[PDB]
């Protein structure tokens, strides 16, 4: 199947409470495999999935040096952005960066990503060409100019097409029993009267990996988008995810409703009905 690696950096200032915290986590698809937290007693890169533990001390130390250096650089960056927005020293602010590479089913680079945000708003992003930037505003333009002058894009491109893909492939192979294993949802439909004349039908998907899933209700074969209550896909804590979709239907019309489930792990997409 298709796979991606992402690192997510969060740098959070907190004036009066020490230097900005920097935390990095790495994911392959929906599987976190590494973390670094500058607030840890002994900050260092720590494994968060079994298949990464086989990496050697050189690997851990390399990650750690990288994250330690980023920790310092992000603190400078927070200072810089505060200035770019004429903000006071009083407020807490956050820079986020998410970057990584997507492979297609053949393991070829599909595309790279390198996006940054400030206080939760798009700030600057590497375009799909991995060569040019999109700055959200005049502040980000300052970063863009600085990065254009330092030919940062070229660096990001080299990483995204090179190390990113190489390491992603390595992880995919090392953790193939899980990373390349799709676990289909376990499904059922529940029925709860909400009154004499309406009942809730809830379509459950449990235990599935990866998180990507489609869960829909149809009435007489028509999508019930607006009438469907669809909870956010949520982690079970055992690597798998859960989701449900609920519709309120006229009592007696239950059999006109079908739940449809699409998931990578399913031999065939599912159609379910309430089974009294």
């Amino acid at each position: 199947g298709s796979h991606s690696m992402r690192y997510f950096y969060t740098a959070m200032s907190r004036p009066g409470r020490g230097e900005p915290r920097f935390i990095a986590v790495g994911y392959v698809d929906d599987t976190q495999f590494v973390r670094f937290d500058s607030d840890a007693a002994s900050p260092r890169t720590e494994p968060r999935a079994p298949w990464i533990e086989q990496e050697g001390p050189e690997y851990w130390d390399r990650n750690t040096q990288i994250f330690k250096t980023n920790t310092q650089t992000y603190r400078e960056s927070l200072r810089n952005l505060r200035g770019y927005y004429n903000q006071s020293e009083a407020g807490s602010h956050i820079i986020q960066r998410m970057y990584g590479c997507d492979l297609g089913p053949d393991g070829r680079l599909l595309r790279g990503h390198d996006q940054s945000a400030y206080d939760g708003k798009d700030y600057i992003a590497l375009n799909e060409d991995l060569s040019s930037w999109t700055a959200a505003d005049t502040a980000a333009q300052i970063t863009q100019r600085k990065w254009e002058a330092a030919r940062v894009a070229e660096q990001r491109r080299a990483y995204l097409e090179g190390l990113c893909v190489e390491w992603l492939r390595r992880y995919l192979e090392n953790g193939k029993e899980t990373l390349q294993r799709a676990d289909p949802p376990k499904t059922h439909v529940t029925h709860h009267p909400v009154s004499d004349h309406e009942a809730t039908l809830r379509c459950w998907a449990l235990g599935f990996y990866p998180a990507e899933i489609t869960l829909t209700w149809q009435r007489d074969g028509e999508d019930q988008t607006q009438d469907t209550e669809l909870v956010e896909t949520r982690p079970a804590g055992d690597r798998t995810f859960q989701k449900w979709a609920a519709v309120v239907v006229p009592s007696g019309e239950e059999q006109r409703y079908t739940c449809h489930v699409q998931h990578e792990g399913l031999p065939k997409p599912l159609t379910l009905r309430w089974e009294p």
Binding site: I66, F67, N80, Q155, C164
Partner: peptide, 13 residues
């Protein structure tokens, strides 16, 4: 593996 520290100075925002 995360993006490696460039030869020179890691460029801040």
């Amino acid at each position: 593996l995360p993006e490696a520290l460039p030869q020179g100075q890691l460029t801040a925002y």
